[PDB]
Design a protein around this ligand. Sequence first.
Ligand SMILES: *[C@@H]1O[C@H](CO)[C@@H](O)[C@H](O)[C@H]1NC(C)=O
Ligand SMILES: *[C@@H]1O[C@H](CO)[C@@H](O)[C@H](O)[C@H]1NC(C)=O
Lengths: 168, 55
Amino acid sequence: GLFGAIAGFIEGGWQGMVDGWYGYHHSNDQGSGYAADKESTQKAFDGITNKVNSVIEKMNTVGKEFSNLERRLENLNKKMEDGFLDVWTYNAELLVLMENERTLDFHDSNVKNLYDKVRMQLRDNVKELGNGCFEFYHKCDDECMNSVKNGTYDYPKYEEESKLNRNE
Amino acid sequence: KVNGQGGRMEFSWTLLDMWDTINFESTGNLIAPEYGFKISKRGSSGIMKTEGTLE
Ligand SMILES: *[C@@H]1O[C@H](CO)[C@@H](O)[C@H](O)[C@H]1NC(C)=O
Ligand SMILES: *[C@@H]1O[C@H](CO)[C@@H](O)[C@H](O)[C@H]1NC(C)=O
């Protein structure tokens, strides 16, 4: 879809990531694994909750009998109720479709933004494979991996080390 | 004939106000109220058409 990440450059999902909607996978000599990015996940959830709520709140708002001399009145009544019915059914079905579209794209965008964050952080200290993975030009241990994840990664620290390896 | 009868009874009603006095006069053919219905409670409700019963 729109942001080109989900079913995008990142080709599939992770059945392996159970803690979140979006996250990381890493491998190094210390080990390998899936990690959810709990912030982005929860925030997206809050957004979706707001969305569906607002759909409920905005939507949240007897018969009669008539004689046989009352044919036009009766029909006027029917046409009215039926009219409002048609209008509300339309509004609902439509609102649901459109918001669905928006929702999927919202998720896509979230992924894209996460990826972007990591990329723009890591710079040329890594190779960017284009599958959603970055291969490091320097040794990245669990502290460094967490630093990437928690947004703190140190470029100048691994800079020239990465440089030499990227070159040779 | 209906119910054996070719005669008829045509019924009319009214809502009598608080403190209002209603007056009847007839030289014949009046079918008259013995009783009349105070409204003891007012509010949202309706008439549901059903062949069913309460459970
Ligand atoms: C982020 O993570 C690193 C590595 O675990 C840690 O040393 C640092 O204190 C954290 N900083 C912030 C601002 O979250
Ligand atoms: C009916 O009777 C009441 C007695 O409480 C009296 O106050 C009222 O004025 C009477 N109404 C009429 C129209 O006579």
